[PDB]
């Protein structure tokens, strides 16, 4: 439909971690279909940041994940007009960040606003330590409340030296027109820094994503 | 640098369920009394398409009464002032967090205060607008890796009864070194004492108080 | 059938982390005053291997001083009584759920009491027995489908300074149908008087007095 | 070694959900390394059961399943010794369980002795008014920490009706003696009810789980 094979990417986040604000622009490209994407990120204010870049790769559209067939799609069913989410991460040691995305379409390049926002860390946590080496691979599991669509997913960020810090994700996906609701199901996702210079204020990013419906029987 | 009456000057930059709005608001208290108020006006994103009420507590501890054998963190910390940041955790999902940080410019407080929420529930009481105040409160303060933490047991009174909780978990930081108070608490009573219509104009008042707790 | 001077007769069976023990207590307290006191004893899987302080607030809010003014849920209780369910989720994961059962026996009030503790580290205050006491407290009380709901911020004093923040969620339900109160506040102080070198033995004190925060 | 292809299984859970004791016994048989295991459950006290019975079924042992050769298995490593987990469910009503099962080897037989103690269901909700239907599949992610082997899951209960109930678990294993440690890993689940009787005083209980290592790359 207004969806191809191959889709560009345009984004803006702004921001703020413990209340230092900040500003990030990224271009793009992604394969929705194959549920594969990757994009350039550029720190434009309140670089170089003081904290994990980490916290910040999930926020940068599940559009990007491969749906079987036999799975309703309610990401690719919303365009042109598009969806938005709205994310909570509540981390284990009380730091919590909350995300929006307002997603558009403009020809065949997604428009992302993002708004970032995360406070509660501790100062000698690994996020504000900047300690965290990758998030693991994750399954998000997903399901319908209240007409719209939900996606709850347990993460872990790998750490430097080992062990692991948890971080809990609550997602409600809109659709800015009426769609087909999905039955409950998965998307497992993998998320990784492919590059970056020394101060993260050049990122080269990957995730890739594909739904299912779990163990059979 | 602390007087019996000092004005306050704010502007709150927020979004809630990716709907953005900007309030600014003037206001006086009386820091040794723990009492003040002010006049808060809607400058975008107007009407408030959610309840005004989640955003009050966010409108500063120095306007808390505190017995001289209990630290105040708070007016030790000014001429420089302090900053605070806030978790809002509500029982249905929603979650808001906030920041401030303030300032002072002669005998006036400066807040900059950034306010998010998301996730709450369509159907839910602050999407439906169907919050009537805050109860009174108390919160209770300990350090934590040498700044000051507040958490507090909230309460919003509902339309036709009962209650939707909130947890609050605040963590305040003096932007210089000062001294570190034991673990206490502060009453708090926060009310909107009126408005018109669609809340585009919001008188609000803060009564709190310090204390040791049962002896 | 509430005499200013009752008796408390008390069993707990427990578990924490797999692990599980008996306790038994017995006591007195005085209704009107909001205090009371009692002596424990460790009758089965002694000497305990957690901090005893876990277990304190679960060995009765009709220990609590109630003005005129706010209507006591606890004391209409009787003498059929009420039970009260209880999560106690700890700032480091390990979580606690209690109940206890009180029915009266002439001028004794007889406690049923389960408690159940799990995910504890192993390196935390509570196996590590690094807790002091229990800070003064403010619950806040507010009727949720026709029974009595209590919140509370709670926090352990710990060894060698800081404290461990526990969140508090309890149900009252009386036995017979009761006025519900307004939504209110009971201010707390639970001690550990004396124990001896394992806790075997524990002489435990609490107070407790009713309000409606400030005005 | 002391782990056969067929294995048996003897169990005695008591508990209390909102203070109402009750106990359950029950015999079953699982496959060890296909991570597939069924069992026969029969209330001893305390029934008919006024509560959902879906929220005690995963109480009712991660030896049952299928674990790669290049995944750590902690858990067959641990026998003949064996090992015991704890565990809460924390439902998103405000209804919290928690659980441990001390798991012994005796012969061709595990032996569990479960404790499962639940509080704060209001009246009205799925749980007490029985309105569960089942549990979806499901992907726990699996961790170190502190030596010790940690299990997190999004759970949700399908609802009479429609729509789901979320409960997250957080499980950890405790070995009986030292064995090797696994990395970040997952293992699907899919717990069913396949019978029973009309107040569950005999319920068949059949689960299939296998471990993975997430998306690629």
Redesign the interface.
Known sequence: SVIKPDMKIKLRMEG?V??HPFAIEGVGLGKPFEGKQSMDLKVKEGGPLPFAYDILTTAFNRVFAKYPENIVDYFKQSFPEGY?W???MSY?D?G?C???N?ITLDGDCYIYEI?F????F???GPVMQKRTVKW????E?L????G?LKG???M?L?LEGG??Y?C?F?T?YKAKKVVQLPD?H?V???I?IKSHDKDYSNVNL?E???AH?????
């Open positions: 703020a413990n209340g938005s709205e994310r909570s284990e009380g919590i909350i995300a929006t307002d708004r926002d995360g406070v509660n501790p100062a000698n693991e691979p994750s399954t599991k399901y319908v409340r209240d719209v709850d997913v347990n872990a790998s062990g692991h948890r809990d609550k409600t409950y998965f497992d996702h993998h990784e990957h890739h994503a594909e419906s779990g163990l059979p029987r």
